[PDB]
Design a protein around this ligand. Structure first.
Ligand SMILES: O=c1[nH]c2c(Br)c(Br)c(Br)c(Br)c2[nH]1
Ligand SMILES: [Mg+2]
Ligand SMILES: [Mg+2]
Lengths: 416, 414
């Protein structure tokens, strides 16, 4: 007897993280949970073979089944095109999925008592709410080949007017130009999700923009957040002795760095990409971070392993060398996805399991059993010896052992 | 007898930094240096009164005299428009000046042995090379009022073709849109300045972009840097056992944070704005940072006090309250400007003076005499008592006393 998991959309990935993904399912999920798994191969070869259609199909399946769990993938560059003999330099699958679903990607460090922080003052968590739609991630950028005029136009759908703004007149040589946008409804959804997250955690909320420079573009984010706060959330914030404030991005980063944590940080798409990584590194390890896309319907989520594909480790693995790759981000993509699945299905057994696997992952590391990266955090990379860490397989074995113990003990406890 | 300073363009600023600016010239510069000072009032009231023309005139005067020194100014928002009863919400004077001059803004922490870092590993300096032209700082952004099509077009000056790219078709409601650009020549100048800085310091250089997303726009920065490195700087870097590498911005920040410093970080305009402040905060204090615009001609510079205008302190000052405002950024705008002036004029006396004032500023803080902000860095703001710091006037007095001693001793040593 396994737990009835329900419907989950899974997206397979690339390189080392693809290997780890299969170990996780084989050792940590499948022995305990029975799932109706809707699998999509987002490996670079399958994306190339389906002309990136598999990415769009996976995003539509998430809309249908409400929970997706995604493995980290390769976003190809010139070198990758040559390596895999790709038809095109395919766009980021994350950008494609996020553009289809919309929402806010909430990112937070996975804290272990024995991992030292780079920022000693951060005693409370920092949650990054990254706007997942538009801006640089759905932009139109091109090379300007020589002298000439770049203009940007708006034509309302009634056809009664046309506005033409001059971007730049290139007089000597060329350069680059780009157009980008955002949608009012997407900004409103981002605001609602940020206010709701601040209220569920009982922490103040800060929105960062550069509205002093982008008066109209960033000014709209600032105006939409303020308007929604004043009309729908101000009394709720006052009741919990918390607040909402707008800050300039350069002021916000410096304020975050010298703070003690304990706040929600609403970031525009590009800033949330950079800041979520910086904050994760500030808590100790870039890889020790959750990443959950919360869609506007309040029912759909996509949990992911946000970090790289770890090419260096993958090359070693191919050459038959020993590797010690951290699987926690991939584990927490599963647990966060299963926890949301459990919440939708009112499934106490799956809710218990998802939480238990997160506890086991943290308790394992805190018991002194970890991969090379985490061992380097504690000791410093030059002082790390083979005895200080477990290889990928040894670490997964330790986790499997600890998970079995935790679930067996919980079964025996509820037997009265 | 005073030192013959030469021609310097000065730009007066706003609020608390304006007060401090006058104290600096009165106590630290004028008693020792005779200057042909070309003064421009970039105070928010004068910018409003001249319809922001004073900003453009100051930028042209920098082109002419090759040295500018700028006080921090207000970039107005809605609240500022009401406060000063402004005709318009005037654009950032820094954006206006940088757009006219072009170049790279080099930013670096001002290190004092007794100020604790937030990042314990940073034992060597991090120099940020911020591209000072285009991108978000010369963008065309607007509100999209409802459903309709946003398009971006390119028309070559020969008129033989027209490219129209669809930005977005707004189907339900409106939003926002923007167009932005950069110039090949400006990118090439940014590359040259970054490679030259890395070679003068003997440190590796990293360029950060998001070329995996903005394949064409950021790809051009990456291609121009690589092309210039391979053709003009690779052997020079190999001779100093240093290197140049491109990194994705999110990877670069994490790598910088866990490093020990000791590198040049070439940043695009927007990233250099955020990262220069983050790095300054990592070394201990946001305000303890130099900011020098190095123009493409290799002759023109604009040194500035890049931090805030300290409105909170200014309000206290107006109410007759005691204030303790750090003047170091404004002092180093003067010293960096005078050092460049001295280099152009081959003036050993001015070169000595500029360096001496930087030494005095650091030695004064290291002797335990500092403003409230620096005292809070050492003790923690709740543990700071009035006896731990000097007010603005007391601190400026300490510096003046120390500067007089240093210059008198150097004169006697001749
Ligand atoms: O953009 C960012 N963010 C950031 C942080 Br959150 C830290 Br702790 C640090 Br030390 C630095 Br350099 C940065 N840069
Ligand atoms: Mg990232
Ligand atoms: Mg800044």
């Amino acid at each position: 007897k396994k737990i009835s998991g329900g419907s989950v959309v899974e997206m397979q990935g690339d390189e080392m993280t693809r290997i780890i993904w299969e170990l996780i399912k084989e050792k940590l999920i499948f022995p305990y949970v029975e799932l109706d798994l809707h699998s999509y191969d987002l490996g670079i070869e399958n994306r190339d073979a389906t002309n990136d259609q598999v990415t769009k199909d996976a995003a539509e399946a998430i809309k249908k089944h409400n929970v997706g769990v995604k493995c980290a993938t390769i976003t190809p560059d010139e070198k990758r095109v040559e390596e895999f003999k790709l038809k095109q330099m395919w766009k980021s699958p994350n950008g494609t999925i996020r553009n289809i679903l919309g929402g806010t990607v909430f990112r937070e460090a996975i804290i272990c008592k024995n991992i030292p922080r780079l920022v000693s003052g951060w005693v409370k968590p920092i949650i990054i709410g990254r706007h997942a739609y538009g801006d640089q991630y759905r932009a139109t950028d091109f090379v300007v080949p020589g002298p000439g005029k770049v203009e940007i136009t708006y034509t309302p759908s009634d056809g009664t007017q046309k506005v033409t703004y001059l971007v730049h007149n290139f007089e000597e040589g060329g350069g680059v130009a780009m157009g980008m946008y955002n949608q009012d409804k997407s900004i409103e959804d981002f605001a609602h999700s940020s206010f709701q997250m601040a209220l569920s955690k009982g922490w103040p909320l800060y929105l960062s923009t550069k509205n002093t420079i982008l008066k109209k573009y960033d000014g709209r984010f600032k105006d939409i957040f303020q308007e929604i706060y004043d009309k729908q959330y101000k009394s709720q914030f006052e009741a919990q002795k918390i607040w909402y404030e707008h800050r300039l991005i350069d002021d916000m980063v410096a304020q975050a760095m010298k703070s003690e944590g304990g706040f929600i940080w609403a970031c525009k798409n590009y800033d949330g990409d950079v800041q979520s990584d910086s904050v994760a590194q500030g808590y100790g390890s870039l890889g020790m971070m959750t990443s959950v896309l919360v869609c506007p319907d309040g029912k759909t989520v996509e949990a992911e392993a946000a970090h790289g594909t770890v090419t260096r480790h993958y090359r070693m693995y191919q050459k038959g060398q020993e590797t010690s790759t951290n699987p926690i981000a991939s584990i927490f993509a599963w647990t966060r996805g299963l926890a949301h699945r459990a919440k939708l299905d009112n499934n106490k057994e799956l809710a218990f399991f998802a939480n238990a696997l997160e506890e086991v992952s943290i308790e394992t590391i805190e018991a002194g059993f970890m991969t090379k990266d985490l061992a380097a955090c504690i000791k410093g990379l030059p002082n790390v010896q083979r005895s200080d860490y477990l290889n990928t397989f040894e670490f997964m074995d330790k986790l499997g052992e600890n998970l079995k113990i935790k679930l067996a003990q919980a079964k025996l406890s509820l037997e009265h």
